[PDB]
Amino acid sequence: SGGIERVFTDKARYNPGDAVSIRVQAKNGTGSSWSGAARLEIFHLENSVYTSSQSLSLTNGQSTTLTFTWTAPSTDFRGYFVRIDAGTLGQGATAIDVSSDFTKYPRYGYISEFESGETALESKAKVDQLAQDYHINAWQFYDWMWRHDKMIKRTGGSIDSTWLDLFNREISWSTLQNQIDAVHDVNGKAMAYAMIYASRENYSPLGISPTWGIYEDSSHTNQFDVDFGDGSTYLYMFDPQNPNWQNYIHAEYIDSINTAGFDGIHVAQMGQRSNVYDYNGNSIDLSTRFSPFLDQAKSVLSANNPARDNLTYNIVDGTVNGWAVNDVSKNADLDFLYSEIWYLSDSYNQLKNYIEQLRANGGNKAVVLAAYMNYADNAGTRYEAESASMTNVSTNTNHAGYTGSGFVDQFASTGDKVSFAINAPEAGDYSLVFRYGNNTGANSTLNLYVDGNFVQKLYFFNQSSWGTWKHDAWYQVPLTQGAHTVELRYESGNVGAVNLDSLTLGTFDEHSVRLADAMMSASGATHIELGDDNQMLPHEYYPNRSKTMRSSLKNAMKDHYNFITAYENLLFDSDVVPNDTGSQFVNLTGVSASGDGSANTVWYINKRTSDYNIVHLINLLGNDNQWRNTASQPSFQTNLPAKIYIGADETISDVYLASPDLSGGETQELAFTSGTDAGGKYVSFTVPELKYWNMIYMLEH
Ligand SMILES: OC[C@H]1O[C@H](OC[C@H]2O[C@H](OC[C@H]3O[C@H](OC[C@H]4O[C@@H](O)[C@H](O)[C@@H](O)[C@@H]4O)[C@H](O)[C@@H](O)[C@@H]3O)[C@H](O)[C@@H](O)[C@@H]2O)[C@H](O)[C@@H](O)[C@@H]1O
Ligand SMILES: OC[C@H]1O[C@H](OC[C@H]2O[C@H](OC[C@H]3O[C@H](OC[C@H]4O[C@H](O)[C@H](O)[C@@H](O)[C@@H]4O)[C@H](O)[C@@H](O)[C@@H]3O)[C@H](O)[C@@H](O)[C@@H]2O)[C@H](O)[C@@H](O)[C@@H]1O
Ligand SMILES: [Ca+2]
Ligand code: NA
């Protein structure tokens, strides 16, 4: 098997003029010798712009790697599709982005691990995989810093080679510096995460004054804080418009750029706080105070280094006219916009409208969303704990909300054990996720053994009652294909007790993820969801690996990111705008349609540039209108008729459709007819295949 195994480029973005080196990795699986050619074609949208061929002979079972050189055309900010054809050996694809500045088309990843064991080679590997497979061109470095108010730890004037972060992880300077070097190698940019307004506890001896702080009340009595739950460890919050706090923390931003080599600062925040005072007791609206900080930030960064002055800011809890949404997106000197969605834009449609507001408020600046998929779902293959092998503990049913036929109780003493026999369909990482109850008044622990080896002590959090199930006890392990044993053991020095409901191989649901990303991108945004060593982002604490992508979803992602890179001019460009105004329409014979992402339908979103009329179809057949929750496989459709009404205005030369779902997102020309109905001007064609997302672009001349 295989054929064309990988297609990718040495770097994630290129400048105009750069030599671009397309690699193609091929392997003959057909138990025979093979001789033929591999043909390279590169398109800018509908138009072929380079073609080339190389002869290829391979014995039975032989692998090789071809290289095709290309030069990036001098028009800046253009994306290209890439096809490789090898006849009977197979085909493949990738995409190329020619853009001098990543902030126009951000494809944002992350890094959250900085382990000392990590070699420069491993660091390059993780960066290289994301850059090659998805064209990630910027990375958010998460929880790299020592302290929030002192990001680089020094002993005298000497940088400490390792340090411990607020959750006691060991951060390595050299690992960090290697990863940054690697990001740069692929023409990546590196964004340091940093708060706008946070110090850590016991701040006064770092010369920070409480008089710079924000307060819950007007007697300067309680400083807004963030409590990490151990009585020691806190963030304290400060006034973004205070000139001393700006002075202090912008000097840290700069230290970070200049010492670590970052290309900018990803500024975070906690979200909405109400009834906010300064030290002196003047009531203040915290939501208008971020962009004066950000303006000042931008200006001291651009003065320090125009090449490394990138800036974004987390608009937390995003939604149409959400807190700080308007002030930030309209008045902050940010290179691009960023927003963490929680529960105010739960429908595909609501989230579309938020993206549109953002894109409109910012002057078609790029928007990136953080939106952790399947966040509330225990998604993946479930193994009931009542159906496993348990010792000195028995099943029960006497507390509601379990899955299956019950759960294992009284898992409270030495020698108690539960063994699950699981199958791993493919070698890879697996998130072992346990659903459980704990009402002992504290944290509870068990020891986790895989195939007879201990792997980690595991914490089970205390809860409001034994009626209440959580599933935030997990650990991620590598596994070979085939059978394995996963075992929890109550041993010596384990504490508390738990009811165990089940084990789950925490898995992102391909269906929901494909839909969510098509929506986001048709709407005009990107999604930060990939990082470290091909992990997908399950939670706001980025080191969290309670879900894993299986290979089926990895491939769809490679397709998705190929797609949004080749078609970035049609998806993201400065002049790409909705057609919401007017009153347009689309008809699909056989299937319901909607313009507002209604449940169990197909969804048209109509957009335009001056060159093209664009309609995205997104297949919500068989699924609700919520973007985040898991979903069923939608009803794929074949040879489906459509008619798109337009205006008396438009004349349409050709019709084109590309989809990540089909031939890796290559563009097909479609046959079609024109004319007029009672409803108005119209055009018509058969959509050969709709799976999750088709984009229809129709050339207007
Ligand atoms: O205690 C059990 C708990 O453990 C893990 O979660 C840990 C916590 O993650 C988050 O808080 C840590 C986070 O706090 C600040 O950032 C918050 C937030 O900032 C936003 O702007 C940004 O978009 C987010 O990415 C970021 O999380 C600090 O600035 C940051 O340095 C620090 O990393 C979360 O808010 C807390 O709720 C969690 O306790 C497990 O992953 C989890 O399952 C478990 O419940
Ligand atoms: O302060 C005294 C102790 O308090 C805590 O003890 C908690 C218990 O932990 C385990 O039980 C887990 C179990 O808890 C409930 O059962 C409550 C009672 O219900 C029945 O009467 C049962 O037959 C009794 O044994 C039990 O007391 C849940 O309903 C059940 O689903 C859970 O699995 C131990 O088995 C108990 O002996 C503990 O009391 C705290 O953990 C201790 O430190 C304190 O000693
Ligand atoms: Ca169960
Ligand atoms: Na859904």
Coordinates of C-alpha atoms in Angstrom, one line a residue, residues 212-406:
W212 CA -1.2 49.5 40.2
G213 CA -3.8 46.8 40.9
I214 CA -7.5 46.3 40.1
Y215 CA -9.9 45.7 42.9
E216 CA -13.3 44.0 43.4
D217 CA -14.4 46.9 45.7
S218 CA -13.5 50.6 46.3
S219 CA -11.6 50.4 49.6
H220 CA -8.6 48.6 47.8
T221 CA -9.5 45.6 49.9
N222 CA -9.6 42.6 47.5
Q223 CA -7.5 42.6 44.4
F224 CA -9.1 40.6 41.6
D225 CA -7.2 37.3 41.6
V226 CA -7.1 33.7 40.2
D227 CA -6.9 31.0 42.7
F228 CA -5.2 27.8 41.6
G229 CA -6.5 25.8 44.6
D230 CA -3.4 25.1 46.8
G231 CA -3.6 28.2 49.1
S232 CA -0.2 29.4 47.7
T233 CA -0.4 30.0 44.0
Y234 CA -2.2 32.9 42.5
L235 CA -2.4 35.4 39.9
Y236 CA -3.2 39.0 40.9
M237 CA -4.7 41.4 38.5
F238 CA -3.6 44.9 37.5
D239 CA -4.9 47.9 35.6
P240 CA -4.0 47.7 31.9
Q241 CA -4.0 51.6 31.6
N242 CA -1.8 52.1 34.6
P243 CA 1.4 53.6 33.2
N244 CA 3.6 51.9 35.9
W245 CA 2.2 48.5 35.2
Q246 CA 2.5 49.1 31.5
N247 CA 6.1 50.2 32.1
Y248 CA 6.8 47.0 34.2
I249 CA 5.2 44.4 32.0
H250 CA 6.1 45.9 28.6
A251 CA 9.7 45.8 29.8
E252 CA 9.1 42.0 30.3
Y253 CA 7.6 41.6 26.9
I254 CA 10.7 43.2 25.4
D255 CA 13.1 41.2 27.5
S256 CA 11.3 38.1 26.1
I257 CA 11.6 39.2 22.5
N258 CA 15.2 40.2 22.9
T259 CA 16.4 37.4 25.1
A260 CA 14.4 34.4 23.9
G261 CA 14.1 35.5 20.3
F262 CA 10.3 35.6 20.1
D263 CA 8.7 37.4 17.1
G264 CA 5.9 38.8 19.2
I265 CA 3.6 38.6 22.1
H266 CA 0.3 36.7 22.3
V267 CA -1.5 38.7 25.0
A268 CA -4.1 36.8 27.1
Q269 CA -6.7 37.8 29.7
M270 CA -9.2 36.1 32.0
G271 CA -12.4 37.6 30.5
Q272 CA -15.2 39.7 32.0
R273 CA -15.0 41.3 35.4
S274 CA -17.7 43.7 36.6
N275 CA -17.8 46.5 39.1
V276 CA -14.0 47.2 38.8
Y277 CA -12.1 49.8 40.8
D278 CA -8.5 51.0 40.9
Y279 CA -6.6 51.4 44.1
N280 CA -7.9 54.8 44.7
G281 CA -11.5 53.7 44.5
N282 CA -12.5 55.3 41.1
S283 CA -14.9 53.0 39.4
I284 CA -13.6 51.9 35.9
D285 CA -14.8 50.0 32.9
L286 CA -12.2 47.3 32.4
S287 CA -13.4 46.6 28.9
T288 CA -12.2 49.8 27.3
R289 CA -8.8 49.7 29.0
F290 CA -7.1 47.0 26.9
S291 CA -6.5 48.8 23.7
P292 CA -4.6 51.7 25.3
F293 CA -2.3 49.0 26.7
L294 CA -2.1 47.3 23.3
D295 CA -1.4 50.5 21.4
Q296 CA 1.4 51.3 23.8
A297 CA 2.6 47.7 23.5
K298 CA 2.6 47.8 19.8
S299 CA 4.5 51.0 19.7
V300 CA 7.4 49.9 22.1
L301 CA 7.6 46.6 20.2
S302 CA 7.8 48.3 16.7
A303 CA 10.4 50.7 18.1
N304 CA 12.4 47.8 19.5
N305 CA 12.3 45.7 16.4
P306 CA 9.9 46.1 13.4
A307 CA 10.7 42.5 12.4
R308 CA 9.6 41.1 15.8
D309 CA 6.7 43.3 16.9
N310 CA 3.8 41.0 16.3
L311 CA 0.8 41.5 18.6
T312 CA -2.5 39.8 19.2
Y313 CA -4.9 39.8 22.1
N314 CA -7.4 37.3 23.4
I315 CA -11.0 38.5 23.2
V316 CA -12.3 36.0 25.7
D317 CA -15.9 34.7 25.4
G318 CA -16.6 35.9 22.0
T319 CA -20.0 36.6 20.6
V320 CA -21.7 39.4 18.6
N321 CA -21.1 42.7 20.7
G322 CA -19.6 40.6 23.5
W323 CA -17.6 42.1 26.3
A324 CA -14.6 44.1 24.8
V325 CA -15.5 42.8 21.4
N326 CA -16.2 46.2 19.9
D327 CA -13.5 48.3 21.6
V328 CA -10.7 45.8 21.0
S329 CA -11.5 44.8 17.4
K330 CA -12.2 48.4 16.4
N331 CA -9.4 50.3 18.2
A332 CA -6.4 48.2 19.1
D333 CA -3.2 48.2 17.0
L334 CA -3.1 44.4 16.7
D335 CA -1.8 42.5 13.8
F336 CA -4.6 40.1 13.8
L337 CA -7.6 39.2 15.9
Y338 CA -8.0 36.3 18.3
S339 CA -11.0 35.1 20.4
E340 CA -11.7 32.2 22.7
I341 CA -15.3 31.1 22.2
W342 CA -17.2 29.7 25.2
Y343 CA -21.0 29.5 25.5
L344 CA -22.4 32.7 23.8
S345 CA -22.1 31.5 20.2
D346 CA -23.2 27.9 20.3
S347 CA -24.9 27.7 16.9
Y348 CA -23.0 27.5 13.6
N349 CA -24.9 30.6 12.6
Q350 CA -24.2 32.7 15.8
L351 CA -20.5 31.9 15.4
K352 CA -20.6 32.9 11.7
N353 CA -22.1 36.3 12.6
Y354 CA -19.4 36.8 15.3
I355 CA -16.6 36.1 12.8
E356 CA -18.3 38.6 10.4
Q357 CA -18.5 41.3 13.0
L358 CA -14.9 40.8 13.8
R359 CA -13.8 40.9 10.2
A360 CA -15.9 44.0 9.7
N361 CA -14.7 45.8 12.9
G362 CA -11.0 45.1 12.1
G363 CA -11.0 46.3 8.4
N364 CA -10.7 42.8 7.1
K365 CA -7.8 41.9 9.5
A366 CA -7.3 38.1 10.0
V367 CA -9.4 36.5 12.7
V368 CA -8.3 33.3 14.6
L369 CA -10.6 31.5 16.9
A370 CA -9.8 29.2 19.8
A371 CA -12.8 26.9 20.2
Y372 CA -12.0 23.7 21.9
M373 CA -13.9 20.9 20.0
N374 CA -15.9 18.2 21.8
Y375 CA -15.0 20.1 25.1
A376 CA -17.9 18.7 27.2
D377 CA -18.1 15.3 25.5
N378 CA -16.5 12.1 26.7
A379 CA -16.0 11.2 23.1
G380 CA -14.3 8.0 22.0
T381 CA -14.5 4.3 22.3
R382 CA -16.1 3.4 25.7
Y383 CA -15.2 0.4 27.8
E384 CA -17.7 0.0 30.6
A385 CA -16.1 -0.6 34.0
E386 CA -18.8 -3.0 35.0
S387 CA -17.8 -5.1 32.0
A388 CA -14.1 -5.3 32.9
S389 CA -12.0 -7.5 35.3
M390 CA -12.2 -6.2 38.8
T391 CA -10.7 -7.5 42.1
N392 CA -12.3 -6.8 45.6
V393 CA -14.7 -4.3 44.3
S394 CA -18.1 -5.1 42.8
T395 CA -20.7 -3.4 40.5
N396 CA -23.4 -1.2 41.7
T397 CA -26.3 1.0 40.4
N398 CA -27.2 3.1 43.5
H399 CA -26.4 6.7 42.1
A400 CA -27.9 8.1 38.9
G401 CA -26.1 9.2 35.6
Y402 CA -23.8 6.2 34.9
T403 CA -23.4 4.9 31.4
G404 CA -24.1 1.2 30.7
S405 CA -25.5 -1.1 33.4
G406 CA -23.8 0.6 36.3

